[PDB]
Write a protein that binds this ligand. Structure first.
Ligand SMILES: *[C@@H]1O[C@H](CO)[C@@H](O)[C@H](O)[C@H]1NC(C)=O
Ligand SMILES: [Cu+2]
Length: 227
């Protein structure tokens, strides 16, 4: 259980959507982060993969603000302290807003994968995952925005999937966090985009999986990485 508390871009903090404060507030602040109803700090499991909840988490609505990112610049997302138990991949997708991200229909966003990290080492099952990398980096993930994509406004959909219960149907725990970015530079790729509700299915080999046994490979779920 956890959520993105803060985002660092070009030497300043953009406060995140504090899901344990703002939902109780009724005049909460404008942020670059999407609002959610996930006040349990919980997940979207396999029962929700073909519901709108999977896109930017349960009941999610666009953030009011959009953060400019320098060309090929870094977006550092800072989580609440991530449990060692919650082993699994950290995956990053962009969808174009074709306009102000604050007014987009989330149901029509088309995501391309810009980064994935999965099973790093399996010497000691369940092993060392991207989630363990995120913990070792004091609960922060660094995303580099490609230079080869068309500039414009994009939703960054940032996700940990926890696999600690994933040996059972609908056991995998998706933690998607969305923020609004204004990508800059000279690129011109418009990568083939996957609907939120076509990202994952509940029987994918990276999703329905027993992590506690020796694993020879791990197929990171979601569409193919763009390069
Ligand atoms: C995280 O930072 C704290 C100090 O702020 C430190 O005590 C902790 O051990 C750090 N890093 C890692 C890899 O644990
Ligand atoms: Cu949890």
């Amino acid at each position: 259980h956890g959520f993105v508390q803060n985002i660092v871009i070009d030497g300043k903090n953009y406060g995140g959507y504090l899901v344990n404060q703002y939902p109780y507030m009724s005049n909460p602040p404008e942020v670059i982060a999407w609002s959610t109803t996930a006040t349990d700090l919980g997940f979207v499991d396999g029962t929700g993969y073909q519901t709108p909840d999977i896109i930017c988490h349960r009941g999610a609505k666009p953030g009011a603000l959009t953060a400019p990112v320098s060309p090929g610049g870094t977006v550092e997302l800072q989580w609440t302290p991530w449990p060692d138990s919650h082993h699994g991949p950290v995956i990053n997708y962009l969808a174009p807003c074709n306009g102000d991200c604050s007014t987009v229909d989330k149901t029509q966003l088309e995501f391309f994968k810009i980064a994935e990290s999965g099973l790093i080492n399996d010497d000691n099952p369940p092993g060392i995952w991207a989630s363990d990398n995120l913990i070792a980096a004091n609960n922060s993930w660094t995303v580099t925005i490609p230079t080869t994509i068309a500039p414009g406004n994009y939703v960054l959909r940032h996700e940990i999937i926890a696999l600690h219960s994933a040996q059972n149907q609908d056991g995998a725990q998706n933690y998607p966090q969305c923020i609004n970015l204004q990508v800059t530079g000279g690129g011109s790729d418009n990568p083939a985009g996957t609907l939120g509700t076509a990202l994952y299915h509940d029987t994918d080999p990276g999703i329905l999986i027993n992590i506690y046994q020796k694993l020879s490979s791990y197929i990171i779920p979601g569409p193919p990485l763009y390069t």
